[PDB]
Amino acid sequence: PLLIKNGEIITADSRYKADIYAEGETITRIGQNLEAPPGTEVIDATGKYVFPGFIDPHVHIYLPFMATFAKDTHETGSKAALMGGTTTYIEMCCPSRNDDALEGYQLWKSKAEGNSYCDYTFHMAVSKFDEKTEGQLREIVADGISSFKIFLSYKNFFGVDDGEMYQTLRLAKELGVIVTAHCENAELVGRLQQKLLSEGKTGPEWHEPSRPEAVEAEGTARFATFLETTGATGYVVHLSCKPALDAAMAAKARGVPIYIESVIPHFLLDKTYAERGGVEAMKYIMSPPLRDKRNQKVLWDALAQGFIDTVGTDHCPFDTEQKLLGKEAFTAIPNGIPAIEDRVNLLYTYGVSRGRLDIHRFVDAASTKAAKLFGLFPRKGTIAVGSDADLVVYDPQYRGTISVKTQHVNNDYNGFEGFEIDGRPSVVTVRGKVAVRDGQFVGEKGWGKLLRREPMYF
Amino acid sequence: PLLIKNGEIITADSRYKADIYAEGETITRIGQNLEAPPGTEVIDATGKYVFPGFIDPHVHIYLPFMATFAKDTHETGSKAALMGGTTTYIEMCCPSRNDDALEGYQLWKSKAEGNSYCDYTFHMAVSKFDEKTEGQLREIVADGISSFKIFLSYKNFFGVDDGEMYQTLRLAKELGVIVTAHCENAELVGRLQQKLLSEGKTGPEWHEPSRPEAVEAEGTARFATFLETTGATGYVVHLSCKPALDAAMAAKARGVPIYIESVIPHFLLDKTYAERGGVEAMKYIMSPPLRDKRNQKVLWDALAQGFIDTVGTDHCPFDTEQKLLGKEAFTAIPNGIPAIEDRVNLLYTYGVSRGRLDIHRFVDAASTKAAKLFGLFPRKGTIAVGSDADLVVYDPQYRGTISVKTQHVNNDYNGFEGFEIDGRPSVVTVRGKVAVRDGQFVGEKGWGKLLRREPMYF
Amino acid sequence: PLLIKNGEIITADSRYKADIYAEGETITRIGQNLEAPPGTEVIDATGKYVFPGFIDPHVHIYLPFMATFAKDTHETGSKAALMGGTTTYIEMCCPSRNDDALEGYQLWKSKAEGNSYCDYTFHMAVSKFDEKTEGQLREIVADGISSFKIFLSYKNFFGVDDGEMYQTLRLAKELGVIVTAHCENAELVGRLQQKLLSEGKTGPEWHEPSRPEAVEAEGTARFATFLETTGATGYVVHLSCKPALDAAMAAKARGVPIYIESVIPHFLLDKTYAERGGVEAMKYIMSPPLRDKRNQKVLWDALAQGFIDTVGTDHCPFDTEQKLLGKEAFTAIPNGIPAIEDRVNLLYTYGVSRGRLDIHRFVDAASTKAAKLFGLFPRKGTIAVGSDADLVVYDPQYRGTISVKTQHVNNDYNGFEGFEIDGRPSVVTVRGKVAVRDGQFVGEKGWGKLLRREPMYF
Amino acid sequence: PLLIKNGEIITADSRYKADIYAEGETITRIGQNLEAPPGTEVIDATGKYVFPGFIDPHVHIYLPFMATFAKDTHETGSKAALMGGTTTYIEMCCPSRNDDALEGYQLWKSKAEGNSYCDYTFHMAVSKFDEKTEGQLREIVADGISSFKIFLSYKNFFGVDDGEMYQTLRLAKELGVIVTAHCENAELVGRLQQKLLSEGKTGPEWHEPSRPEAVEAEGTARFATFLETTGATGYVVHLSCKPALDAAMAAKARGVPIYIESVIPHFLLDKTYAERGGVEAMKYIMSPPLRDKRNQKVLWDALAQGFIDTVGTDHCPFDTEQKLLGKEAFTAIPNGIPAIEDRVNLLYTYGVSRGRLDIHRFVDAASTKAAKLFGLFPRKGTIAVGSDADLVVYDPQYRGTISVKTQHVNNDYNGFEGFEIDGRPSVVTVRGKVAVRDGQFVGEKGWGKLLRREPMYF
Ligand SMILES: [Zn+2]
Ligand SMILES: [Zn+2]
Ligand SMILES: [Zn+2]
Ligand SMILES: [Zn+2]
Ligand SMILES: [Zn+2]
Ligand SMILES: [Zn+2]
Ligand SMILES: [Zn+2]
Ligand SMILES: [Zn+2]
């Protein structure tokens, strides 16, 4: 059993000093003097905050790339998540047009199975819609996966055409599934990439211009129109800039059931990072690209008002040696920045401690809303009797810095090297079991489990 | 002591089956199968929801009109509120330019003292800014009133000119006060009023065109600009229409600390009700006016996304005989529609039961966010250990209709006559004491207390 | 030679009383009291306006539908045009995906050759992009056709997918060609069509909801984004509604070289006309559909400010018997409304005589700007020495009504039956030769010539 | 008499090679071989363009400032205008709240009378609306002044309050008068000025922050609302930035009869100029302030599409010694930048020659539209038989630079020092009389006359 005593409990809709007792995997009682039994593991949260475990709706653990693979395993990625206060992650399951979807699902599941320190689930990529698709997706959804992922990008590999998007969305609606979507334009990006390379513009600084804000804005609007016409519910992944936010907001305002995620690098990093030349720039190549810094205030301001629903990472780690596969052409740089371990600390620090983000909006944006949208609430995402005992005792007196020298992610650079932090998770629990204590990793191999969900969005 | 057992507890961020025990005035413990001392008021909430007491941030109880007065007293109004599931109301304290501000506040405070069945507080109207009034306002703030009310309307009686508005906002920011604001344009309303009357256009149907959406849009944008330049935090009361929403939203999007209230008649009633002729139309005269029905969808959609932060009533009850003071000129009709008792049932029915509003957004919009914004949280607005035991056991199986024949508000008409509802409160408590039991009123005279709040917005 | 004396000359940028003399085909001199050789056709324009011949940038003359054809020939259509004050028309040359593009152009050219009473040119439809067609298009351009037409609609028959659209735009930019575009969404229209029919919703009233404003908005935004990325110049044909206007306007505001056409039925007719049932409704079926009447004000207001650049017709005449090919399914109704003869009188009446449209904006929107955009200026579109002596002596004192009983278009209904008009052409000339005299047709068969234009938009 | 032969005549709606003959003050004939009489002054325009005389709708000649006066007289200012190709200017007649309006009008008229080299007129400032105003304004308007000027700025000196603005606009509408307006906010600017000075922020770099874009956007929207409510027609002077353009465009789109002027410094200069320190910065202090450079593309793009109707200068010259009156406080820097002589050359060069502005839009924006809006067309603003023979023979082969060393404005600095030009006026005529020949000044003292106009906008 677990007793977290003397802490200040903070959720999206509560802030109070009381103790929390969990007999086993779920919270059993909250109050004063709980009378825990002999043998209970007791955590003294005096002077600290007790938050719901944080939830990252957007990560990449297993991911092939051209001739290689991203760096985290389920083991290394879940450890890194927990150290950062993230107790549930949702991975993009990404079979390509060339792969069988159901085989893909099964392959991802097999990688994670028994190998995660914390709970997890998947969004299912629909990278084509052919005569076999519907039956396979129906099997995946009935297996507990209540979200799809589509790409309006990556022509012939992940992108879906308008007919396929229509079919996907109509099936999602019939199934109650939420459609997450990467919103660019496959044709425009591919053509601009090719034109730029044909002019000898090969370095990393041409990535951003190959897929400018206008392209993300067109795809975000297109997705919204297709949700509106089909009746499906959707979720825009990694929204990066003002034109896209305007398109998604206009859809929200007119009644489209559309939600918005932004990811941490777009709040804190900007397009000049990718203008640094060489491998230093390649570290900062992701899609959508880092943008003009003017977009940061726009995202922060929108987050503070709840216009942006969730904050994820689009965690996608590669070693510098892998980055350098793009030395001759920017199109060959594996895209991604790592961030799974640093999301909470970065949001707390630059939002709550130094910014204008309210602590309640912070909990909602980094835990609760994502749980709600993806069918993990109320098991996950809050602090209440009956919910999973996934808890973070957070130290607001902690001062430090982020660095690759102290990170757990299985690569060789940190995207926030040298950034100051104003707090950290002291203790982190997964279903009543302590996985981080005094800031140190003490997780149990395979303790995490796949979360199966019931579709909600008919 | 109080024990609410076997209910499904629903807050803005939680949903679970457990019991709640309050030894006295505040929640003491939450857990499954709690024990309570003999003699405890045990409430069996099987099959029902348990919500935080709802909170109406915008009512009028005492309010002079010519040589009469709005109809509810603190006693009638607070009883009505409770019957409807509202356990805290915030009343607009409204001395005019021709009244002394401190004498007005003391008069309002004197009316409520010992006469409310539930807790309450005030927003202080600033109907002029000058040396005496400023000193007055400073003492009112120190007495725990942490919000002001200004009017961009009602020239020479309640409205403030630009200099007054700037001075008011600056003072609010000095004092950490949030400014609530009625946003029209005092000049344009008065000129259109006078023009229409000059044309013999005297009937109630001319009230809306005397103050069209354009004027609300301008006032809302003006207020936002003033908040933006002064640094003050503000709250748009009773936002009724799309052009006003667009103005407020643009301000939110660019970082102004501005929040949005809408009131229940603007969700459910439309301008044609005020076109019915005679006293029947007069029943539906309020400011801002009921609008073209197209605005309802706009408001519901914005509410579902959290763009609108709170739902209040602008409760302002008059008898039909008093409405008829305006028989000869629409400008002489006492403005207002009653709604304090019906808000929660209406929002629950048309939003949650029949609409697209999520139950969690419902709780946030009808209780929690108002508590947060006005300094009542966490005492009010949520269910957590330590919070005032202001609770509603709500029956989602109730079916019925609203009628003047069954209302508690002390006037002779209901604006929502005949409207179906899909739920009602069964039990309602105030600080651990049951005020409504099995749908019957059992409140204790004067049990409610004035809530004093601390400055939050420096 | 021709002498038009004593008229009030009105162009987009001039308004004066003087005479115009043309020795032959072109304006030779302008001045007060000009002398002309004996035998001159002297036209006394006292009391009347003299305008540049009007120019319709969007008509259909030859157009197959199933095993029939739209009703006007080049002879009937050009006569109708002239009677209405239109001295140049631009016809959409529309071979389908299943037709050879060059054979289509040669067929269209062959239909018009020697059969037009006034000058004319074409926009070339690109209904597919592939190696053969591209070569074809290049020869058509070289023959003087400096505009293309694409369709974001009509899947598999006329529409282009994204790759085709990008290739088309890129070719246009290479060749200095302007792309005109019908902006809907081919997927969404086809799916909604099929869904509605599956529900037994077969009548004409289901045509509008099969292709709602949302779909036009999406296509207009998509086209704009494609122009923006390709560098091509473009022109939105028949823009019908506010959300489409907003998309096109946002593109204009951010610098895209995009222009906007609206057509006369969308100014004056609304969706309820297509809700009349039966053949009566079928008369009013066109694409994009007639819209909610709220859009009329939007279009008039935008026209008065020059936000809409040109007014055309989308003239596309069918007999009622042909409309009835759609008796069993709205998808089988031949789309189109006639208007070539009535455009100018309608715009003049409802805009200038009765509305808020300035006479100078009228001339620009109905003649000059179309000439500019399509490479016909300064030969066409204005009154100046050197310009083709294509002139309209317009009687602003005429009062009458439009009727099928008096029309020249070769079908059996007028969409504007009974509409009042407040002016008509008295005299109309084509290259110095009078075609309409005292309101009577006196044109010379085959006098009109194909206009060849030079590339302008590299 | 005057004959301009061999030129390429370019107006907003014509481009052709022909000759122009004027017997006296107006164009008499246009054609080839005009047969001018003995004694005619002949201008050989071979290889050059012939444009309508350009028109500056916004200048300051006589203008008091705190204890001094702007530098141009009617003599020096009109000479400078003509050298730059501007043959008509419209001066802001600016009596303050402390002055009698009719006395002001009379004073301005007396300064100009007999002292201008070219034609001119005034906009009448309405700096208060009291019991004498209406009669005085009615006398001014009946004297030929068909435009007013109002200020939403300069509290207690030029600014009008909402009641005064309402009265002004309603009288304008009754009279058919167009209301030009400086759109900021008097309260916000004054309060921010004072706050900044109170913090020791005194240098010129604090001017822009004292009246940021948001304030211009609020005033532009307010003005638009008041035009919409009163029914008056308006014209936004010197619109400088995107937020303001958005407000004015939204009003245009919804049907408000509102027009937009921008002035040349806001196309070509930016806020960093005023950050240079010292008198160098003070040279670039005007109101509205130079803005972030991002606004330039926004204005150019809007101009190219006709969203911005006119280009003026807000010519307002002061010597550097006068600028230095603001050495201790930025509020004491006389505001203004000179530009009357350089407007055309700057627009031609950076718009037509090096930019994307079409030559027709250039003529419209710099001549024709302003003539139309202010009742000077068709006497002024175009090239047609009967119009005043105000003509510019412009040399497109001229290459040079702008400098104070070669300027005619009666001050000691040029705001475009060192800017390259790609053309210049070779010959300029006023009502048939040559005022500039071979680029040299040959004007006749007092040849210019006051233009009286008939109101148009009821
Ligand atoms: Zn992605
Ligand atoms: Zn991703
Ligand atoms: Zn109010
Ligand atoms: Zn109120
Ligand atoms: Zn079409
Ligand atoms: Zn067409
Ligand atoms: Zn000004
Ligand atoms: Zn000025």
CA dihedral sign of residues D77, D82, D86, D90: positive
CA of residue D57 to ligand 8 center, whole Å: 10
The sign of the dihedral angle between the CA atoms of B83, B86, B88, B94 is negative
Reference A130, options A161, A164, A103, A159; nearest CA is: A164
Nearest ligand for residue D313 CA = 8
Which position has the token pair 């009078």? C434
Choose the closest CB to A221 out of C187, C221, C229. Answer: C221
Radius of gyration in angstroms for the set of CA atoms belonging to chain B, rounded to a whole number? 21
Question: Nearest C-alpha of chain B: how many angstroms from D99?
Answer: 24
Q: Is D32 on the interface with C (CB under 8 A)?
A: yes
Instruction: Say how many Å lie between the CA of residue A348 and the centre of ligand 2.
Output: 23
Residue C162 is nearest to which of A187, A192, A228, comparing CB atoms?
A187
A268: DSSP letter: H
Smallest-distance ligand from the CA of C240? 5
- A253 CA: distance to closest CA in chain C (Å): 14
Q: Which residues of D touch B166 (CB under 8 A)?
A: 187-188, 191
CA geometry: angle C420, C421, C427, nearest 5 deg: 150
Q: Say how many Å lie between the CA of residue A213 and the centre of ligand 5.
A: 30
CA distance C243 to chain A (A): 11
Helix or strand or coil: residue C241? Answer: coil
In 3D space, the residue among D14, D379, D394 whose CA is nearest the CA of residue C30 turns out to be: D14
Do the beta carbons of residue C9 and residue C15 sit within 8 Å? yes
Best mutation target, A8, A23, A242, A305, to test chain B (most B CBs within 10 A): A305
Residue identified by tokens 């029947």 is B280
Question: In whole angstroms, what is the distance from residue A57 CA to residue A73 CA?
Answer: 17
Give the C-alpha separation, B240 to B289, whole Å: 8
Q: Letter for the amino acid at C254?
A: R
What residue type is assigned to position A86 of the chain?
A: T
**Could you tell me which residues are beta bridge partners of residue A363?**
none
Nearest to B209 by CA among B145, B285, B130, B120: B285
D18 lies within 8 A of chain C by CB? yes
- Ligand that lies nearest to the alpha carbon of residue A90, given by its number in the listed order: 2
In angstroms, what separates the C-alpha of C424 from chain D's closest C-alpha?
24
All residues of chain D having their beta carbon less than 8 Å from the beta carbon of residue B218 are 221-222, 225
Residue B140: name the closest of B183, B173, B97, B108 by CA: B108
* A409: helix, strand or coil: coil
What superfamily does domain B1-52+382-458 belong to in CATH? Urease, subunit C, domain 1 (2.30.40.10)
Separation CA A282–CA A296 (nearest Å)? 21
Q: Does domain C53-381 have CATH number 3.40.50.700?
A: no
Listed by number, the residues of chain B in 133-162 with a beta carbon closer than 8 Å to a beta carbon of chain D are: 161-162
B458 in A contact zone (CB under 8 Å)? no
Nearest CA in chain D to B243: D250
- Contact of A154 with A130, CB cutoff 8 Å: no
- Which among A304, A240, A247, A248 has a CA at the least distance from the CA of A268? A240
C-alpha B63/C-alpha B71 separation (Å) is 8
Q: At residue C265, what is the residue type?
A: P
Written as one string, the DSSP assignment of B332-361 is GSPP-B--TTTHHHHHIIIIIITSS--HHH
Q: Do D18 and C386 touch (CB under 8 A)?
A: yes
Strand order in the sheet with B258-263: B54-59, B86-93, B119-125, B147-152, B178-183, B234-236, B258-263, B310-312
- The DSSP output letter for B26 is B
Residue C262's identity, in one-letter code, is S
CA A100, A106, A107 angle in degrees (round to 5)?
85
C195 contacts chain A (CB < 8 A)? no
Nearest-CA distance A211 → chain C (Å)? 10
Contact A217, A184 (CB under 8 A): no
| B307 near A CB under 8 A | yes
Q: How many CB atoms lie within 10 A of CB C88?
A: 29
For residue B275, the tally of other CB atoms under 10 A from its CB is 17
Chain C interface includes D231 (CB < 8 A): no
Interior/surface letters A233-265, b for 16+ CB within 10 angstroms, e for the rest: bbbbbbbbbbbbbbbbbbbbbebbbbbbbbbbb
> Does D11 sit within 8 Å of C14, measured CB to CB?
yes
Is A307 at the interface with chain B, CB within 8 A? yes
Q: Which of B13, B356, B385 is opposite residue A382, by nearest beta carbon?
A: B13
Q: Are B318 and B71 in contact (CB under 8 A)?
A: yes
Residue A410 tokens read as 């299985």
b/e per residue A69-88 (b: at least 16 CB within 10 A): ebbbbbbbbbbbbbbbbbbb
* Homologous superfamily, domain D1-52+388-395+423-443: Urease, subunit C, domain 1 (2.30.40.10)
Give the pairing type, strands C2-11 and C14-22: antiparallel
Residues whose beta carbons lie less than 5 angstroms from ion ligand 6 = C 314
Q: Measured between beta carbons, which residues in chain C are less than 8 angstroms from residue D254?
A: 301
Q: Is residue C304 classed as helix, strand or coil in its secondary structure?
A: helix
Burial status of residue C253 (CB atoms within 10 A of its CB: 0-12, 13-18, 19 or more): middle
Q: Given a contact as 3+ CB pairs under 8 Å, which chains touch A? A: B, C
Residue C163 CA, ligand 2 centroid: distance in Å? 25
Q: CATH number for the A53-382+398-422 domain, one of 3.40.50.2020, 3.20.20.140, 3.90.1530.10, 3.40.190.10? A: 3.20.20.140
Q: How far apart are CA A294 and CA D209, in angstroms?
A: 18
Angstroms from D209 CA to nearest CA on chain B: 11
- Residue contact D222–B226, C-beta within 8 A: no
Quote the minimal CA–CA distance from A257 to chain B in Å.
9
How far apart, in whole angstroms, are the C-alpha atoms of residue C120 and residue C102? 19
Interface of D with C in 233-252 (CB under 8 A): 249, 252
Q: Report residue B233 as tokens.
A: 């935090």
D163 neighbourhood in chain B, CB within 8 Å:
187
User: Per this entry, what is the length of chain C?
Assistant: 458
Concatenating the DSSP letter of every residue in C355-407 gives SS--HHHHHIIIIIHHHHHTT-TTTSSS-STTSB--EEEEETT--EE--GGG-
DSSP C1-51: -EEEEEEEEEETTEEEEEEEEESSSB--EEESS----TT-EEEE-TTSEEE
Cβ C125 vs Cβ C153: under 8 Å? no
Cα(C426) to ligand 6 centroid in Å equals 29
Count CB-CB contacts under 10 A for residue D200.
8
Q: What ligand has the least distance to the C-alpha of C158?
A: 5
Contacts of D218 in chain B (CB under 8 A): 221-222, 225
- For residue C145, the surrounding DSSP H or E stretch is none
Place of tokens 């390259």: D420
Q: For residue D444, report the distance from its CA to the centre of ligand 8, in Å.
A: 27
Question: B226 at the D interface (CB within 8 A)?
Answer: yes
Q: Which token pair is C74? A: 């080049």
3-state SS, residue D453: coil
* Resolution value (Å, 1 decimal): 1.3
Closest partner residue to B222 (CB to CB) among D186, D192, D218 is D218
Q: Chain D interface, mutation test: which of B183, B218, B220, B249, most D Cβ atoms within 10 Å?
A: B218
Q: Is D177 left (phi over 0), alpha (psi -120 to 50) or beta?
A: beta
Neighbours of chain B (3+ CB pairs under 8 A): A, D
Q: How far is the CA of A92 from the centre of ligand 2 (A)?
A: 7
CA dihedral (C203, C207, C208, C209) in degrees, to 10, reads: 80
> At a CB cut-off of 8 Å and minimum separation 6, what does A70 contact?
A60, A61, A62, A63, A316, A317, A318, A334, A336
Q: What is the strand order of the sheet A8-11 is part of?
A: A14-17, A8-11, A49-52, A391-395, A424-430, A433-437, A440-441
Cα–ligand 8 centroid distance for D179 (angstroms): 14
Residues in chain D: 458
Give the 3-state secondary structure of residue C248.
helix
Pair type for strands D29-31 and C29-31 = antiparallel
CA A189 to chain B, closest CA, distance in angstroms equals: 29
Smallest CA–CA separation between A77 and chain B, in Å? Answer: 28
Is it true that the peptide bond before A378 is cis, omega within 30 degrees of 0?
A: yes
The Cα–Cα gap between C347 and C268 comes to: 9
Q: What is the largest CA-CA distance in chain D?
A: 73
Q: Could you give the CA distance from residue A237 to residue A309 in angstroms, rounded to a whole number?
A: 11
Q: Does B83 touch chain D (CB under 8 A)?
A: no
Ligand at shortest distance from the CA of B151: 3
Tokens of B211: 């103050």
Which residues of C are less than 8 Å from D386 in CB distance? 16-18, 32
Instruction: Decide: residue A198, CB within 10 A, 0-12 exposed, 13-18 middle, 19+ buried.
Output: exposed
Could C11 and D16 be called an inter-chain contact, meaning their C-beta atoms sit closer than 8 Å? no
Q: Which of B324, D170, B250, B458 is nearest to A249 (CA)?
A: B250
Distance from CA of D252 to the nearest CA of B (A): 14
Give the domain ranges of chain A.
Answer: 1-52+388-395+423-443, 53-382+398-422
Question: Which residue of D14, D15, D255 is in closest CB contact with C297?
Answer: D255
| Residue D234 CA from chain centroid, whole number | 16
